[PDB]
Amino acid sequence: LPPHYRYGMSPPGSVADKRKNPPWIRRRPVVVSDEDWYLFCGDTVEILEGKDAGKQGKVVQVIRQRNWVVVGGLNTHYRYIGKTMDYRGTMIPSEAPLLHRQVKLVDPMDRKPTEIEWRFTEAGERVRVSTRSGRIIPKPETWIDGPKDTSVEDALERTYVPCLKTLQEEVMEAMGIKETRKYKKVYWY
Amino acid sequence: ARNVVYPLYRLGGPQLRVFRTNFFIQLVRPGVAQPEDTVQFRIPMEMTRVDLRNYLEGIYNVPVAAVRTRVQHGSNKRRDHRNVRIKKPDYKVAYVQLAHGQTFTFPDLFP
């Protein structure tokens, strides 16, 4: 990917991405930072402004490069999908990006949008705390294997009897192969 | 192995044995009507003929009869937006011949 790359709503690896931004466009970049970043994937946030302000909802995707969150189902506009022909296809509501500092984090029991600090707690160590109330708001949010996965038992066996014996030799010792001949010194320069 | 220093053999030194061999291989479908017992592999450039015979007799234990390799050149004619040539990598192709008429046919992946 080039420098000065505008990050759309697409991921960097899409067919839609290489429609929108082929390598030969050099549009003017956008302006933004500050790695104490408090908006996370799956938080419940409250949009302050725009249209449909005063509403509270879940953020389904964070794009750090343009400092974007996208709330689920909200700050929306209706687009068409497919339509493939001169017929309508289907209309789907699609969610605009939300700027950071447009949207704040809601308290989980007070249910008011607040501001968020990082105080070092004694529990160990740094979870995002609310300003006005206390009430530390957490970082919020079935497999069984097949033929070519091992186990949990078989990945932590501690087979390493830890000696200083140079793997290409440790193999050849136990493999039974017996080299009698000696390696003659080469002028290494 | 590939991309490494070879310890030089003088006259009566030890046999150069490899462990943890770097090069990987892939088997393909031949498109220009290859016979049975003749199976086509795609080989990295720095790999000789007998380094396939010992490789198949070691790892996959297949009775290899006769190996024939050939370097197929990469197409240089492809130009970017900056009009610079981008060259697809040339590679070696092996036409391994099998012993005892074991007669491998290439299966129909994605049937």
Binding site: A16, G82 | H81
Partner: peptide, 29 residues
């Protein structure tokens, strides 16, 4: 997913030169 078509790419090609001095001729001596 909204279906789409293939991708294309097209540009121009230009060059220039200067041939020679020019034009052998003759006149009145």
């Amino acid at each position: 997913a909204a279906a789409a078509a293939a991708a294309a790419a097209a540009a121009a090609a230009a060059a220039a030169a200067a041939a020679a001095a020019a034009a052998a001729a003759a006149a009145a001596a």
